[PDB]
């Protein structure tokens, strides 16, 4: 149904006289499509999904210029944030930037965002209205006044409501086979006895796309909040995803428990039982 | 496509 385009940017200062590591990635939904890495040979934005390869040289020169321009902006910021926070030059520090747009089923603008972090904590984020800012602390208020004076919000609003959305649509058309496709979870259950009276039942969901899934356990038709271990959704490496949920179960009572799988790739919700 | 509304902090 609904879609997203998301760009993530990391710059890491290296200590002393020391040039920063820069990595930028772009996604559509849960599929990576582009990369810049400052450690690679090319110093160009590079294709990572087959449907972007068809783009002409004006795109590749164009995107590269922008992604470098990001990096060299991040470089100045690393110097500036050292000053704003009274930090020496002997340390390694990190700036992260995220932006992008969400769209609905009709591919119309839903919601845009532009967030910024220093050393893994919120610095400044564009608000939902895209007119204004949350400055998380006092150095970020200085930045908030700069960005307000410079009409940064306006510029980002034009990108997030316009450009982001228009490019998102073109990406979903050109890669319609890959991007508008769902991979239903292939599901199973394993059973390992741990003591003479108890057992772990583990419900597997494998090779699904997109990553969004719900795995829940119920015992006798009621949600098992208690003994649920639920791992973080993990990539398989082939563009699809994996997840499991487990419960601790007294032996003889394994058929009290149902595993429930919700995924948009599925015609109905799935129910699994050990039998 | 990436942006142009991005400014030094």
């Amino acid at each position: 149904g609904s879609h997203s385009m998301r760009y993530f940017f990391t710059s890491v200062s290296r200590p002393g006289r020391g040039e920063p590591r820069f990595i930028a990635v772009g996604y559509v939904d849960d599929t990576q499509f582009v990369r810049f890495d400052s450690d690679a040979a090319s110093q160009r934005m590079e294709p990572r999904a087959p449907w972007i390869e068809q783009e002409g040289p004006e795109y590749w020169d164009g995107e590269t210029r922008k992604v470098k321009a990001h990096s060299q902006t991040h470089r100045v910021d690393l110097g500036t944030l050292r000053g704003y926070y009274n930090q020496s030059e002997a340390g390694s520090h990190t700036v992260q930037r995220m932006y992008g747009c969400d769209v609905g089923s009709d591919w119309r603008f839903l919601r845009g965002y532009h967030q910024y972090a220093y050393d893994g904590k919120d610095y400044i984020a564009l608000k939902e209205d895209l007119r204004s800012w949350t400055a998380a602390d006092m150095a970020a208020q200085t930045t908030k006044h700069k960005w307000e004076a410079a009409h940064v919000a306006e510029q980002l609003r034009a990108y997030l409501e316009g450009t982001c959305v228009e490019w998102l649509r073109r990406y979903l058309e050109n890669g319609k086979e890959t991007l508008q496709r769902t991979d239903a979870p292939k599901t199973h259950m394993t059973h390992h006895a741990v003591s003479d009276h108890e057992a772990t039942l583990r419900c597997w969901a494998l090779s699904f796309y997109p990553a969004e899934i719900t795995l829940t356990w119920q015992r006798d038709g009621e949600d098992q909040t208690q003994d649920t271990e639920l791992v973080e959704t993990r990539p398989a490496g082939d563009g699809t995803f994996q997840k499991w949920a487990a419960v601790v179960v007294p032996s003889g009572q394994e058929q009290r428990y149902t595993c429930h799988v919700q995924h948009e790739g599925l015609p109905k919700p799935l129910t699994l039982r050990w039998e | 496509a990436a942006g142009i509304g991005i400014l030094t902090v």
Partner: T-cell receptor, first 102, second 113 residues
């Protein structure tokens, strides 16, 4: 690369509407600018535009159509101090701000 | 009052000589540019800089060196002076890449053999 403007010279009588067009090659261009240049002087900004559609500023209306790669400037009610070479500039990414011929 | 200043406003060069056009800006702009203007061909981008410390080649970089040590300054230097560089040169700046460019006064340059 290519930023292409309307072929001049444009002779337009006083009080009329004058009309300037600009085409560009880069589909991903995100910033668009109209500049005024009197003879032997610096270009100065008339208007910037970022989004598709109409931008009003007094006697000046900017129009941006990203799909056909088109930028325009309509000059209403034209005074004799509008007599200048008009410059379209289009941004091709990072620092690649490229001008038309004028 | 914050602006952009170019220097000199006009120069006549003998061929082969080196010459450096100054461009300085008070406005705390990250981005700085140099253009050449010629009769039929409009403005042509020579070199740019998106922030203090970094540069980039434009449409016509050849014959022209550029430098960006600090935020304020972007001087344009010409090593071997050919007659094809006879032009008017405009320095400009913009607060960040892709915003409105603000132009300096202009330099009229004629290299004579």
């Amino acid at each position: 690369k290519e930023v292409e403007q309307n072929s001049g010279p444009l002779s337009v009588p006083e009080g009329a509407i004058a009309s300037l067009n600009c085409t560009y090659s880069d589909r991903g261009s995100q910033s668009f600018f109209w500049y005024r240049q009197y003879s032997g002087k610096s270009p100065e900004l008339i208007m910037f535009i970022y989004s598709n559609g109409d931008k009003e500023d007094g006697r000046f209306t900017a129009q941006l159509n990203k799909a056909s790669q088109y930028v325009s400037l309509l000059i209403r009610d034209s005074q004799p101090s509008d007599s200048a070479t008009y410059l379209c500039a289009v941004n091709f990414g990072g620092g690649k701000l490229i001008f038309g011929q004028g | 009052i914050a602006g952009i200043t170019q220097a000199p406003t006009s120069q006549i060069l003998a061929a082969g000589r080196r010459m450096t056009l100054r461009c300085t800006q008070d406005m705390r702009h990250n981005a700085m540019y140099w253009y050449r203007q010629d009769l039929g061909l409009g403005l042509r981008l020579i070199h740019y800089s998106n922030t203090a410390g970094t540069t980039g080649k434009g449409e016509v970089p050849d014959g022209y060196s550029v430098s960006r040590a600090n935020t304020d300054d972007f001087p344009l230097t010409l090593a071997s002076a050919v007659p094809s560089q006879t032009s008017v040169y405009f320095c400009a700046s913009s607060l960040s890449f892709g915003t409105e460019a603000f132009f300096g006064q202009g330099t009229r340059l004629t290299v004579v053999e």
